[PDB]
Amino acid sequence: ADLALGAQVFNGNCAACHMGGRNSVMPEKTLDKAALEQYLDGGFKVESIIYQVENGKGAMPAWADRLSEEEIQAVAEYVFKQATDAAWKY
Ligand code: HEC
């Protein structure tokens, strides 16, 4: 999908906690492929990330009220793309 929009959305909303694909609230739950396979409900799939973005999880807020449907799909695919290619620079 729109990967340029995904970065804009990730950069303006998610980076407060996932700077560099890291996790400042919970160090272990990072945005790396292996963290995702291990800690994200549903595993490493775009769908699992979308679900977690819209409904939140614990200290992670829900985004359904703040982002649009297309923004959620974009950010999810962007995060997916980053983990696959292991492109997170921290
Ligand atoms: C800080 C207050 C956060 C913001 C802003 C966003 N996320 Fe987050 N995320 C945060 C926590 C503490 C956690 C784990 C919560 C738990 O109880 O398990 C997460 C987790 C994720 C994950 C899964 C990570 C993993 O299991 O290894 C994803 C895929 C995720 N977060 C994505 C993400 C995106 C795209 C955001 C912007 C829309 C976003 N998070 C904001 C804390 C915070």
Report d(CA 31, CA 21) in Å as an integer: 5
Report d(CA 67, CA 63) in Å as an integer: 6
Q: What is the DSSP string of the chain?
A: --HHHHHHHIIIIIHHHHGGG--SSSTTS-SSHHHHHHHSTT-SSHHHHHHHHHH-BTTBPP-TTTS-HHHHHHHHHHHHHHHHTT----
Residue to substitute in 5, 13, 19, 29 for testing ligand 1 pocket (most ligand atoms within 8 angstroms of CB)? 29
CB 72 within 8 Å of CB 62: no
Report d(CA 28, CA 52) in Å as an integer: 16
Q: Give residue 49 CA to ligand 1 midpoint distance, Å.
A: 9
Instruction: Show the domains of the chain with their CATH numbers.
Output: 1-90 (1.10.760.10)
Q: Give residue 3 CA to ligand 1 midpoint distance, Å.
A: 19
- Resolution (angstroms) equals 1.9
